[PDB]
């Protein structure tokens, strides 16, 4: 968020987006030109996007419906079981990994 202090003692995840919006306003808005702050509009939407996630929620909804409807329609040959997925990148399970990656 806007403060700079997050939950682990490290910095807030939306702080870079807040510092850019403040930087943009201070370095574009002035008394001579009231309309420099219109440059700050995209910077302002991004700070809200890092805060609420409505646009990234909207993209994943579209692609997720598109993705499932494609995999559902798509031809199915052999499902890689959870044990096979659990054996990806192991020391002596080369056969399982090859099946998972279809290579």
């Amino acid at each position: 968020m806007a403060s700079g202090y997050g939950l682990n003692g490290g910095p807030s995840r939306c702080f870079p987006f807040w510092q850019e919006l403040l930087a943009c306003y201070v370095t574009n808005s002035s008394e001579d030109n009231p309309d420099g702050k219109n440059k700050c509009i995209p910077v302002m939407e991004d700070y809200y996007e890092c805060l609420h996630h409505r646009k990234e929620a909207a993209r994943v909804r579209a692609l997720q419906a598109a993705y499932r409807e494609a995999e559902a329609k798509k031809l199915q040959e052999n499902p890689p079981t959870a044990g096979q997925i659990r054996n990806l990148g192991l020391l002596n399970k080369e056969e399982d990994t090859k099946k998972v990656h279809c290579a």
């Binding site: 968020m1 806007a2 403060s3 202090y5 997050g6 939950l7 807030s12 995840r13 939306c14 805060l51």
Partner: protein
């Protein structure tokens, strides 16, 4: 969503209450609780320790209010003799 539901209970338990003033003073404690909950839930979503700091300071002043309330309530009771709120 529980934030609104809790806030509405404390608002009506304050305004629609026809029992006694300790229940008046309780319902304020519920409203502040719901607001603190909204602030605590938002702060986790925005990675902000400031919201938890804000929450802790609403707990400290919510206890200060309830001590000042109970102190004033005792003063009033010593003289009136009932802290029951009377209708009709």
């Amino acid at each position: 969503n529980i934030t609104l539901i809790l806030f509405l209970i404390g608002i009506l338990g304050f305004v629609l209450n026809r029992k006694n003033i300790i229940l008046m003073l309780i319902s304020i404690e519920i409203m502040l609780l719901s607001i603190t909950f909204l602030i605590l839930l938002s702060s986790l979503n925005m990675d902000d320790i400031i919201g938890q700091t804000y929450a802790i300071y609403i707990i400290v002043v919510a206890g200060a209010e309830s001590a000042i309330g109970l102190g004033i309530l005792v003063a009033f009771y010593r003289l009136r003799g009932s802290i029951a709120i009377e209708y009709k």
